[PDB]
A paper describes a structure:
Insect Toll receptors perform critical functions in both embryogenesis and innate immunity. Toll receptors are activated by a complementary family of six cytokine-like molecules called Spaetzle (Spz). Three oligomeric states of the receptor were observed at near-atomic resolutions, suggesting that Toll5A is highly dynamic in the presence of Spz1C.
By contrast unbound receptors form head-to-head homodimers that keep the juxtamembrane regions far apart in an inactive conformation. The structure of Toll5A homodimers (chains A and B) was solved at the highest overall resolutions (3.4–4.4 Å), with a head-to-head arrangement, maintaining the C-terminal juxtamembrane regions far apart. The Cα atoms of Cys-783 at the C-termini of each receptor chain are separated by 207 Å. Such a structural arrangement –if sterically possible when the receptor is expressed on the same cell– would ensure that Toll5A is locked in an inactivate state preventing TIR domain association and signalling. If receptors are situated on neighbouring cells, such an orientation might be relevant to cell adhesion. The buried surface area is about 1000 Å2. Interestingly, receptor-receptor contacts in Toll5A differ from those observed in Drosophila Toll structures, which involve the N-terminal capping region and the hinge region between LRR domains. The Toll5A homodimer interface overlaps with the Spz1C ligand binding site, which suggests a direct competition between receptor-receptor and receptor-ligand interactions. Moreover, the presence of unliganded receptor in the Toll5A-Spz1C sample suggests that ligand binding is reversible.
Author numbering:
A (entry chain B): 32 to 784
B (entry chain C): 33 to 784
Write the structure that this text describes.
């Protein structure tokens, strides 16, 4: 265990012992450097300023340590690093990491006079002009990295490293690879040349490497190859060539890499063509990644014989008009990508040979219509993508041979799919439509966003039993009914941004006992007129029903009503229903009925007439409904509405009325609310008022703007007012015709005696 | 997610890994890379001139909570989002801006569009901040400014008023102006380390009320004010390290009742501590005073604080101690006094402390421990006494601590011996004074680098729970099997000792399957006959209980070549000089070997006609018996059996030539005789019978034989040849005195 050195005046370095790693700051006044030391795992030495004074240090005692990470600290000129770091006697060090920024250091064997048994090594930002003799003294060195330094390597610097395993030459900006730079690397298994400026790779560039398994040229400036560039790498298995600017690959580049397993060739822009049988006869090959290139057409024999492929990516090219038999020899192919390829159409027999194929991509192409035989023998297909195409429709037998299709994506298309699109030849054998989704019982997720869908097919809730999502946004849905909601699984049936004018529901919900059945209904020109009441009563009332509509953004589309109103702040009383089917309603009157309250409105208040308009009987059933509400406020010349007898009116409003000389014939059977404003109250008689009875329903009368004579012949009116005080809206406002003042003060004067 | 479609009229490309999608602009060379998560992060770093991202194609990436910029230059006045508009990210909840390129004078215009930002961080780029620069955020929880020289106005932070974590690290602040923290009501950390604050005024923390965990880890603080911390009623932690001040004001922490953790270390100039500095701190839990320069302490330093569970006082310059320094701390758990200059411990130091689990006293200069030092420690678990000057241990040192588990006594002047504790009072002739019998559960004990004489039997008798032990660099005289009586998986260590010899019983065994490890490396272990049992134990065996590590073992003054290895050990090399002066001649002693089981003189010497007669050195206690003859390649006067040859179990001669041999001269009591370079081939009466097949290794050899021809000896030669199978006669036999009389010669041939 390493503990802090005993405090003394000989040394000014302050050791702060932490539970994990003992810390240091040797110049106590100004800690220009700190030495974070673990027990025996690592040593972290970093300098912050120009002065070094390594000789004026307490001579720490660490002993054996695995990793020695020195950062941004100077080295003595042409002296061993362990000699320049004598103030800590690190020994038996395996890994050495040297970050250095201020000054580049020319390297020779004299800098490594203490690291004969070094396993790992790393250099960064500070190494320039490595000498050929630098690595001679090393024994059993397995890794080497030259990280972020501008460098130029003469051929032969690595000849002394026989046992080297991983070599990293990233970011060095090498201009070119001399033939024979890797002479001594006989046991090399991996190599990296990413982020360099290698102009070209000659035939003899990779001489001396035979057991190499991985290669890496991720970012270079390679303008051309040679036909025998990779011929010397018989053991190659992984190859990464990205972001290179070359125009084409030479014929037969991989003629000898029979052990190839993965080939990542992506973003190699300006790669317009691929040579004939580039990847032929590679049994071990399993993953091919040719995305983001600029290829315009693939040769037919590109993959002839490579039966071991399981993943083939070809996205983001300019690849159109695929050859028919390109994928004939790949029976293990699992994932195929063809997106962003500008494909106008694919050959009918393109995918017949692949009996097994899990996931297929065809998105972002320019497909117009899929062939019926495209998916005949894909018995293992699971995920299908067809988004962002120019599809008009789909053949009726398109999914006959893919019964295991879990998820499908058809968004951003021009699919029509009318209700009668797949109507049978008048057979009528099956109630469900003949849409191709009928055989897809395994379907789970379906997307149809941004389409021209104009219905919800019956097979989407009858045959598909495990459906759990059905996106139908931005397509021309005409309406919604309760039948189409008869799903048998938790489904988030999205229906936003459709032309859903109206929706119909029944008061009883047959939903199975489960969590919920969401229906997103945000932006629709919903008609808040008749036939929508039960939906409104459902949404506004709080209940534990399965249906959970999301109508927070939903508004109405009725100019007569409050347009742009929300249901959460909508008066359900104001729902109205026009009587368009009937023609016996009085002319020049707003004819409608409200189903919630069970009322029918005549609304002849707009016009003024000489007689009471004929009020049609509620011949329309309206669920066996027998009450009428009439507004006749403007008409004040009828002189009698005596047709009210043998009628079922329940509301009456006469803001302006003729002289109130009415007979008991006018007295109605079922009138709840009555208004007699702006009339001659003097003409009315007690016998008519006596026959008024609240037994049928509650009675409320209006005495506003009414003039009634007060005298002995007009007696008992005050008693009737007192009895009907609740009926009278303002009994005090009722006044004698000549006096114009309330008769309450003169109630004692009412009695003649 | 999906990279931009078709990459048309764009010089920047997408990688689209399954975890995150990278970007570069490699049209000529990729200067900058942008990699994004689904919604978590966006990292943006550029490595060249800013003109390379003047008009990049817009990425239109979804808004992500965390944004990062590295070494990217931006314009003088336009906001950050406007400069990086091509990213098209708006919902930012974390911003980090590393900028090594060029300092920029921040104005309030830079952060428009981030009115919901948190975890704002400005590293290495800020040079100066104008007032109300942070105004407008309206909700900020964490801020950090680091690695950049600064000089701030008092009213810079007034606008925030919701900040909880503030960090001004390595900013090179010359000093703290009063009221510079005025507007930070809800602050809860400062992290003012690595600055250059010269001193703290009384009003240096005016605007802070909900503060906790004030940090001053590295500063050039020269002095403190009396009421520096008075303005902070709530203050949980306080870290004040690596400062050049010489003393603290009296009553510095008077008003901070909530003080829970005071870390005050590495103040090399802090010569003394004020009295009752820690007074009346009930909530205090851990206090750290290590690595200071304090030389003396006041009596009332910790008065009125019973909540202390940890107290570190190590690496200081303490020379004396107060008596009641820990009177008011009955809840203490650990006490560190290591690396100080303490020469003694007060007798009444720890009567009132009972929850102490571990007590550290290493690297001090203690002369001895008082008997009642540990009298009241009912929960002591670990004890350290390393690098001290302890002479001996009192007999009742561990009387009051039965819970003790580990003990460390390295690098001490300990001189424990067999009679260092034995007293005639109540003597039981065993377990002298019981120095360690009171510790039942003593697991680990280190006595490395001491002057202990002998192993106390108490370690191997009643310390059943012992798991390890180390007696290296100690003056142990020897080892015996009786010392190995442990009842657990003990790993005893005796490396580099003065053990002359080990006496191990041949029938040593242990019933349990638990293993015992013993190391004798660098021990003299002189190799004599008694070491034969140790040699056998070291020899490879199928299974054993005492696994010996003897790779670096050496033999003291060896009879054989010096620095002999155990790989070259042999049974014959086990022979040792006998201690019986009368029994063996003074010229050379009897071998009396045990493994070899042979007795022979080491040197031939002058020689005698008759070998001396001595009793068997083994005396029936060993298989050892005389089997060899010292005389070799010498003209012996005679070889008589009565000259102890009969007493010798066997006879072995080397290049000894006898002209005449007789049956009387041949030893009958000896099982067999072996001779070489004999001058006579005649067969004696004893030679007429073949020596015993078993228990008689010595025999006759055809080689190095001289034939003698005589008619009477022909029958004896015939009898010898009948038993002989190597050859009819000697290979180098050329004798024919007018006839054939050799053993190969037939009966018909005669000597004449
Ligand atoms: C030299 O570096 C390599 C890679 O950095 C180290 O490899 C380790 O390998 C083991 C094998 O499973 C992994 O678990 C570790 O995570 C790897 N380490 C690292 C840092 O990636 C190797 O250990 C290093 N050699 C020494 C002596 O430290
Ligand atoms: C819905 O899909 C239509 C497809 O027409 C999108 O409208 C654009 O149509 C033109 C046709 O010439 C395409 O070139 C464009 O790419 C389409 N726009 C986009 C953004 O892809 C329309 O934008 C889509 N609506 C969405 C996705 O909300
Ligand atoms: C801003 O930083 C804070 C502090 O790191 C984050 O909050 C969490 O803080 C705790 C502190 O104990 C950490 O252990 C967590 O890891 C932090 N959360 C995360 C997600 O890292 C906070 O999340 C940060 N803000 C954002 C938007 O990431
Ligand atoms: C064993 O302990 C002794 C002392 O207990 C060590 O000797 C001391 O070494 C230091 C090293 O600077 C000197 O300052 C002291 O004066 C020495 N004291 C004595 C009494 O010699 C010794 O180094 C330790 N190790 C060994 C292997 O003996
Ligand atoms: C390589 O390893 C082998 C065996 O591990 C060893 O014999 C040889 O000396 C090593 N060479 C170098 C240069 O380390
Ligand atoms: C819907 O999800 C809930 C969640 O617990 C589950 O209990 C219920 O069974 C699901 N619906 C069906 C039809 O399984
Ligand atoms: C219908 O009723 C409303 C209610 O206020 C009234 O304003 C309107 O004039 C009526 N219309 C007709 C034609 O009577
Ligand atoms: C702190 O946050 C609250 C919560 O939104 C806000 O109202 C207040 O204005 C913020 N304080 C400042 C100074 O912006």
């Amino acid at each position: 265990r390493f503990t802090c050195p005993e405090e003394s005046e000989a040394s000014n370095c302050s050791c702060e012992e932490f539970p994990s790693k003992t810390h240091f700051y040797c110049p106590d006044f100004n800690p220009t450097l700190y030495v974070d030391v673990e027990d025996r795992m690592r040593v972290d030495f970093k300098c912050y300023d120009e002065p070094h004074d390594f000789k004026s240090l307490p001579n720490l005692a660490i002993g054996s340590v695995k990793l020695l990470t020195v950062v941004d600290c100077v080295l003595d000129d042409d002296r061993p690093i362990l000699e320049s770091f004598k103030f800590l006697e690190v020994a038996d060090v395996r890994s050495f990491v040297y970050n250095n920024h201020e000054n580049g250091i020319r390297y020779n064997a004299k800098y490594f006079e203490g690291m004969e048994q070094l396993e790992n090594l790393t250099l960064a930002r500070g190494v320039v002009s490595i000498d050929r003799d630098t690595f001679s003294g090393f024994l059993n060195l397995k890794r080497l990295t030259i990280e972020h330094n501008k460098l130029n390597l003469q051929p032969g610097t690595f000849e002394a490293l026989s046992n080297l395993t991983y070599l990293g030459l990233v970011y060095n900006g090498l201009n070119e690879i001399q033939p024979g730079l890797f002479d001594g690397l006989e046991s090399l298994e991996a190599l990296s040349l990413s982020y360099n400026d290698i102009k070209s790779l000659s035939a003899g560039s990779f001489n001396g490497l035979s057991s190499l398994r991985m290669l890496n040229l991720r970012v270079n400036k390679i303008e051309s190859f040679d036909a025998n560039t990779f011929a010397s790498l018989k053991e190659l298995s992984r190859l990464e060539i990205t972001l290179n600017p070359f125009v084409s690959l030479p014929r037969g580049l991989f003629s000898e890499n029979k052990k190839l397993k993965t080939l990542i060739l992506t973003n190699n822009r300006k790669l317009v063509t691929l040579p004939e049988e580039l990847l032929a006869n590679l049994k071990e090959l399993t993953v091919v990644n040719l995305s983001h290139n600029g290829v315009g057409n693939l040769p037919e024999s590109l993959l002839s014989g490579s039966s071991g492929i399981i993943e083939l990516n070809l996205g983001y090219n300019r690849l159109n008009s695929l050859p028919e038999e390109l994928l004939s020899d790949q029976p293990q192919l699992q994932v195929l990508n063809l997106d962003h390829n500008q494909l106008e159409s694919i050959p009918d027999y393109f995918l017949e040979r692949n009996v097994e194929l899990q996931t297929l991509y065809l998105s972002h192409n320019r497909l117009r219509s899929l062939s019926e035989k495209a998916f005949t023998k894909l018995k293992n297909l699971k995920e299908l993508h067809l988004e962002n195409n120019q599809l008009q429709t789909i053949p009726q037998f398109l999914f006959s041979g893919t019964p295991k299709l879990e998820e499908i994506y058809m968004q951003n298309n021009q699919l029509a799919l009318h209700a009668n699109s797949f109507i049978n030849e008048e057979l009528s054998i099956a109630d469900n439509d003949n849409t191709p989704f009928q055989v897809l019982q395994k379907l789970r997720i379906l997307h149809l966003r941004n389409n021209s869908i104009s219905t919800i097919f019956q097979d989407w809730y009858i045959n598909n039993l495990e459906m759990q999502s059905l996106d139908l946004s931005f397509n021309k849905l005409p309406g919604l009914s309760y039948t189409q909601l008869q799903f048998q699984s938790n489904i988030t049936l999205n229906l936003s941004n459709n032309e859903i004018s109206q929706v119909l529901l029944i008061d009883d919900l047959d939903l199975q006992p489960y969590q919920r059945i969401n229906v997103d209904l945000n932006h629709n020109p919903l008609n808040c007129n008749c036939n929508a009441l039960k939906f409104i009563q459902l949404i506004q009332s709080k209940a534990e029903h399965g249906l959970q509509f999301n109508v927070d953004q939903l508004r109405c589309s009725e100019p007569p009503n409050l347009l742009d109103a929300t249901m959460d702040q909508l008066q359900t009383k104001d729902l109205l229903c026009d009587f368009e089917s009937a023609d016996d309603c009085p002319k020049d009157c707003q004819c409608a009925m409200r189903l919630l309250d069970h009322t029918v409105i005549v609304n002849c208040s707009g016009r003024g007439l000489t007689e009471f308009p004929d009020l049609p009987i509620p011949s329309q059933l309206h669920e066996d409904f027998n009450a009428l509400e009439v507004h006749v406020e403007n008409n004040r010349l009828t002189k009698l509405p005596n047709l009210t007898k043998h009628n079922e009116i329940t509301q009456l409003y006469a803001r302006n009325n003729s002289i109130q000389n009415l007979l008991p014939h006018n007295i109605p059977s079922k009138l709840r609310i009555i208004d007699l404003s702006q009339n001659l109250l003097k003409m009315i008689d007690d016998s008519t008022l006596a026959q008024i009875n609240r037994s049928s329903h509650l009675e409320t009368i209006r005495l506003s703007q009414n003039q009634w004579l007060c005298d002995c012949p007009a007696s008992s009116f005050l008693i009737f007012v007192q009895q009907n005080s609740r009926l009278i809206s303002d009994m005090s406002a009722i006044r004698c015709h000549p006096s114009g003042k309330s008769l309450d003060s003169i109630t004692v004067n009412e009695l003649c005696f």
